[PDB]
Amino acid sequence: MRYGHFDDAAREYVITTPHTPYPWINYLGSEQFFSLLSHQAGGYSFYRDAKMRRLTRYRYNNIPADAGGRYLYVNDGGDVWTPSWLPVKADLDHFEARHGLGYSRITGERNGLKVETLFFVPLGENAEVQKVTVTNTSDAPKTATLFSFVEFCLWNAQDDQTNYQRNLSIGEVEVEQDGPHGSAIYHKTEYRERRDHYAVFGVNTRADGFDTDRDTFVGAYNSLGEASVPRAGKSADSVASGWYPIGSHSVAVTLQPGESRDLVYVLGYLENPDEEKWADDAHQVVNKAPAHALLGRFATSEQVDAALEALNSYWTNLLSTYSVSSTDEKLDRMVNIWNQYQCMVTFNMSRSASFFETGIGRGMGFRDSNQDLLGFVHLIPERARERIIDIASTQFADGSAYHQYQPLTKRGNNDIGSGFNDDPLWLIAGVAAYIKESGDWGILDEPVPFDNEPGSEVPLFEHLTRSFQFTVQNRGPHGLPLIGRADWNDCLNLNCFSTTPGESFQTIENQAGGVAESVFIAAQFVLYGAEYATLAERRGLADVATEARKYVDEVRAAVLEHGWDGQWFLRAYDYYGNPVGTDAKPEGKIWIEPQGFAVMAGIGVGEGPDDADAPAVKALDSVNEMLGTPHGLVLQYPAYTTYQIELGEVSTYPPGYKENGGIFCNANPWVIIAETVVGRGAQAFDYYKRITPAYREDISDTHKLEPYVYAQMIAGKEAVRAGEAKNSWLTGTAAWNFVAVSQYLLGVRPDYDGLVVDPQIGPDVPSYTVTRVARGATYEITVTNSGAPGARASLTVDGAPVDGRTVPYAPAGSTVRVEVTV
Amino acid sequence: MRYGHFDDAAREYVITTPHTPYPWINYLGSEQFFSLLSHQAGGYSFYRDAKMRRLTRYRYNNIPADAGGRYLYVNDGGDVWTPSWLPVKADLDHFEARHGLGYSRITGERNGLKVETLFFVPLGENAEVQKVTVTNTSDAPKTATLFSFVEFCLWNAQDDQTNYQRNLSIGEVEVEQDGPHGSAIYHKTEYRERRDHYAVFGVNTRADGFDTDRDTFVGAYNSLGEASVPRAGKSADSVASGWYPIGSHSVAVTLQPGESRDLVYVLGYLENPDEEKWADDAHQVVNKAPAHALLGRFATSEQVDAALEALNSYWTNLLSTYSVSSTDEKLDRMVNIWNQYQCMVTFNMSRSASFFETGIGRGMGFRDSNQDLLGFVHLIPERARERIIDIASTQFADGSAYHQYQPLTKRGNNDIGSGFNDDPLWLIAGVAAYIKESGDWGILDEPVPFDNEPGSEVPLFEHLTRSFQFTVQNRGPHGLPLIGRADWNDCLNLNCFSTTPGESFQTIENQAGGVAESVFIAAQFVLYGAEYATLAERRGLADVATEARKYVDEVRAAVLEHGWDGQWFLRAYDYYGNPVGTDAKPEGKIWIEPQGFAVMAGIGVGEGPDDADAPAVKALDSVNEMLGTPHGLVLQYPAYTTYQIELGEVSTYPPGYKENGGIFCNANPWVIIAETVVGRGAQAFDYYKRITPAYREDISDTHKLEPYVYAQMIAGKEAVRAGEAKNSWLTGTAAWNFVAVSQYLLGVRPDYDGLVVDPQIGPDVPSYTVTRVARGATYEITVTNSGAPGARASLTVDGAPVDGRTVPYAPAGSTVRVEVTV
Ligand SMILES: OC[C@H]1O[C@@H](O)[C@H](O)[C@@H](O)[C@@H]1O
Ligand SMILES: OC[C@H]1O[C@@H](O)[C@H](O)[C@@H](O)[C@@H]1O
Ligand SMILES: [K+]
Ligand SMILES: [K+]
């Protein structure tokens, strides 16, 4: 059961019906201006920050879902329809939506008129451009009137949705029917006061009519599907004063048989300097100069086409760093196109704004943006470098950090909680990934403030020291790191004990004292603490490095001595020192996070995959047996069936959802990587397939959400909805699966001084070639892979055998030809 | 131009079409459980607190407005319609909605089936009850299936609308088709964890089927008007897991011509003790005991009719304290029914939850609840006493207060700002009003904490001292009170200077220093500081009262020496010491608030209304000429046409709306009362009529909002929407207009030791009788009123002349007969 198909050649997912299981969206824009666009044109646009500068209005939990967005009502003979199907839902002769890289096309045809709209955000522009092609597909001349529609948001999305007592009186527009390139509407709410920015909605023709008042265009008592103006066949030329500003133009079109016409529409974000805000001395008329400029940049079809081609070439360049050619077209399209595109989206969006995240409370996460860098550093390392400096600037002098920052201002806030004790080490992970990818050791000398405070700058390396020493100096009675509010699992809140509803577990005040410790953070510390030691060694700091490796040794030993339950790693100790994630308890016996992470860190790894005695093997067998399902690995088993006061939010989910028995996808890749470490390629690859979009496309009707991107959660076996996803697009799962597949399964992974080539994928991919650009050289990596259990590669480079699996980095302009035998 | 009419005998407003200019609501409930109910059954319900315990979901800014509520879909041979008209919008043969005191009835008829629903919140119950009567009005048998529908909210409304990434997995329900009185659905989201409460939706018959999943009931791609289940003609028996829980039952009914059937539905809020939360040892099944009991209390039509009659008698009793019989039926319906009913609603809701206030950021206001007490103390003095203690408990030791408190917890917060310097004086105003009404001097001895701190309790009188002294100790260079963040006008922010958007002026950090002073607070202190001085003397604190009288006299002199512009009172001095509200500036020349309040306080009052040299008369004449429009008096003139950085939020509204040139109705009765003080009854009554619902009913298409309640703002003459109101129901306009008409125009006003009888209403009301119950005796006050300017009453009581206009309070069970000659 499928609603579409992948088009690899066009780098598109083609949706062949309006009637998907749920709205399926694309993101347009990769720089500072973003649009969410569903396959029914639903969604919204924002500049830098979805909460603070949201241009256009979108209703979450609408009835029906996704009724609202960028509509073009066609009136042909009194019949009104939209090519996006919603909101009018007229029967279409033909419908198709293609979601591509930074653009989508939606096409609807009815009664001899085909209307195709290309939507995209052009490079270097803070604007969503639409090119509409209307074609007369009948054998007689046709006429119709097209009515564009977008509903503006009053910038601050939180105020827009809750502060009507003020905001129904502040909506302001200007209307310019006869501008330099066509007609434009300006949405300028609050430009009278503190905003130096306004929006424009314009078209490259002189429109017959316009409307700026929603209530007049739609009509009293009517939904969008029943809009009065398009049914009457004539705009009302409404000029809004408060209430609900919109942008709408009417355009009369006439077409000979087989003839088409292109219209270009632009939604743009403009700023003026304070000294030039106004066209008039009375300060009532906005200075339209930047809007006129933008509209002249997209005044013709040739301009749109040229910008769409520049975007296509930009994607080709971005995707040229890592690619694979294998026997498996599903694996290839993920590695080559979709997983990398999704890593761009998560880099830009963090967990802020999707069709599930509402673009209000959540900004750029400290943990989330570090995990995202893992899968992003090969794509645009300069932008990764800058994101590291932004993130690190929100860290405090003691090594702890704001959990997230406001994207518009880059200042940290406590809006979704504070004191998550895994956050500091994630900074080490992101910088080490960055340095291995780029060889830019100089980033460690970059001056970086604490909490953006002028004069507080220290080199970025010293921030890593603060992160490292935060964990060293905050260990509990077993020598494991204190958990604080929660670790990577936000719902494991051991210092909470809340019995009173009203406040989120993520923000509620926690109690001081206790001895709550995390095995997860212990594993994270052994893994990334070893990276910090290497960075210190490279900087000549022999005493810092030696001491660092000693602490890493103590914590590893603490995990084996006090974090081991017998057949799997313990999860935590609670506030009173009682173990969590032990077979001694009836529920929450085994939790996935320490099994994946401890083994990734090398803890408990013995002689080989068939060392029965090794703790890593026992842990992974337990995972397989107790957490394994056909849709992936659940977070813990059994789920909790009653509220456990001492554990916080985790048991408040019904069993099989989110952190209580859900398949929490971000943790799956840790087990996939763990299995490659022990030498079980076939098992690692099997788990990759269970959660990976291209492999789940055939069950589109079960997964429900986009078949082309990872989601945060799939409902687990304990859920009546087992198999169904929530929270698509915005998840650490995108970066960490990209890591897993590109670096551990396919095995091509940068290290500080060379490229490790260490395939561990099992027999289902018996040969493949990776082309990898690293440190200015191209490595063509040809793999013959028996998939024999535990077998690891030997290499020949440019015809000479080499020792080991690391190819020392070659000087730039090389093609290095690596032949791999597994 | 009208959409209904008043029915005085039934104490109802009758809306005779679905097609009003805006949804027109009623409030059900007077105690702890409340429903907002539109004339199309739209709205929602909550227990105590609209933010934290919202039982049912409502979308503000829905398209169309108010699509969502308590619906009853009728399927009659495949034809589907709702008697509320929305959401199906099928053509109705007859439609009527009647909004009454605590209940509403909505009736719709189509093709021989009439469906009438009575909605109400019964006394002493946390439930909304609907009694539905279906009548076959045709000449042949009918069969129809009735589908009830309500959509649940996940309690925390803020979370409900923003936190889908969590809350789409937590919705949980139980279904009980075979309960003790009929069928019921339980909505129990988070009852698993910290919540001790759940909602029930039940009907008093064994239903044919049920639905609890919205998406199954409504159908993919469908709006509520197109819901699949009612169109199919049978329930889907859906059991929700996450997503959107609803309550729906189906009942097939068969009726002979003329036959009717009653069905009783209940939406109830239930709590269990922690120890009795669960029916079963495993804690998986909710204890239904309180829901079964509730459903048993409304299992019959007779039980509903009894509760409805008890609610009618409760309102007859509440309205027996003050009533008027005159020759003006518009005046009498406002005084006897609608204004008192509104004051009950504002007492209960403050500014929290309406069709404009979103029941999220706003709780119970310190200023707001004190102003509302002014019009409520005579209705239920025992509840007003309790509210005073609740408010005063959120005051700090230095006399300043939290600006509002959370209704569920009664604890103050800064969610809409802090340091509004008019706040502390309002407490004195509320307590003086209460003691005058009740003679309950012992309230001053009640122990009241500061900021709810156990152990911090001082007598309530000492809180008034802290109020009084905060003003004394915070006056500026001219002897006028420092303004702080704002005074009563929340948009006058003289300490703000914000040039960067992103944060509300109400919450944004303010600048220390400057000399900004408020003439409004000066007046407020003269008026209420004088009451404090009286209270101090009555408490035996002679020297404290002598000191208080002296400070009142200082501030009074300062208003005339430094707060007088020439022809009207100044508004403020800004942060720099420059006057605000002076004829020296081009915009904002004259502000309404100090003209009304300074003259209420007696400042500038001369020999009589024809003393053209008295500053009060000059000021009121400038008000009439500069601020007076046919819709009421605007806040200031001219409105600001550009942003004035030193004045904060005010100039951010486009001219003619809200605080920038809007008719801000709460300030009008200050001018009405001021005009009675100077002896111009005719002009006072004129201003009362310009804004009063019964007088504006004849321009319902202009006003747009409910024609039976005051609104916060009517757009002013500078707006294109001149005459159109926003923010109905929840405004201090209701209490202050009640004070103006009952106590100053009709002239019947409690004082500490007697009842003042001082009519000042002009010639349009030449005879009337007030019946007033005060301090346990009833006063029958018969007024013969020439309305000649400046003529004041003389009284005879029980046949004997009295001196002056104060009738000393008679002992209980008197009928005191007062004859009044003006
Ligand atoms: O916070 C509440 C306040 O918000 C301001 O924007 C409005 O202008 C005021 O009228 C309102 O009282
Ligand atoms: O604040 C964000 C956190 O909210 C919690 O309610 C969810 O369970 C987490 O998955 C999420 O990461
Ligand atoms: K997480
Ligand atoms: K106010």
Side-chain angles (χ1 to χ4, degrees), chain B residues 749-812:
Chain B
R749 80 178 158 266
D751 205 343
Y752 292 108
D753 308 322
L755 183 73
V756 171
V757 179
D758 181 28
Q760 200 59 26
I761 192 166
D764 291 347
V765 192
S767 51
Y768 63 90
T769 296
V770 171
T771 309
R772 175 57 147 111
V773 177
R775 313 285 185 99
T778 297
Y779 295 79
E780 187 74 358
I781 299 161
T782 299
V783 183
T784 296
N785 163 49
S786 73
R792 231 116 197 149
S794 44
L795 311 176
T796 64
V797 173
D798 305 320
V802 293
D803 286 327
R805 282 179 282 273
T806 301
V807 180
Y809 285 128

Side-chain angles (χ1 to χ4, degrees), chain A residues 367 488-490 659 664 666:
Chain A
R367 164 198 302 145
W488 164 91
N489 182 328
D490 290 331
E659 280 91 344
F664 224 91
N666 186 347

Side-chain angles (χ1 to χ4, degrees), chain B residues 362 367-368 371 422 487-490 659 664 666 712:
Chain B
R362 296 187 83 175
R367 164 201 302 143
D368 311 294
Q371 291 199 283
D422 64 312
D487 52 28
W488 171 94
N489 186 329
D490 285 329
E659 280 95 338
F664 224 92
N666 178 355
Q712 178 195 70

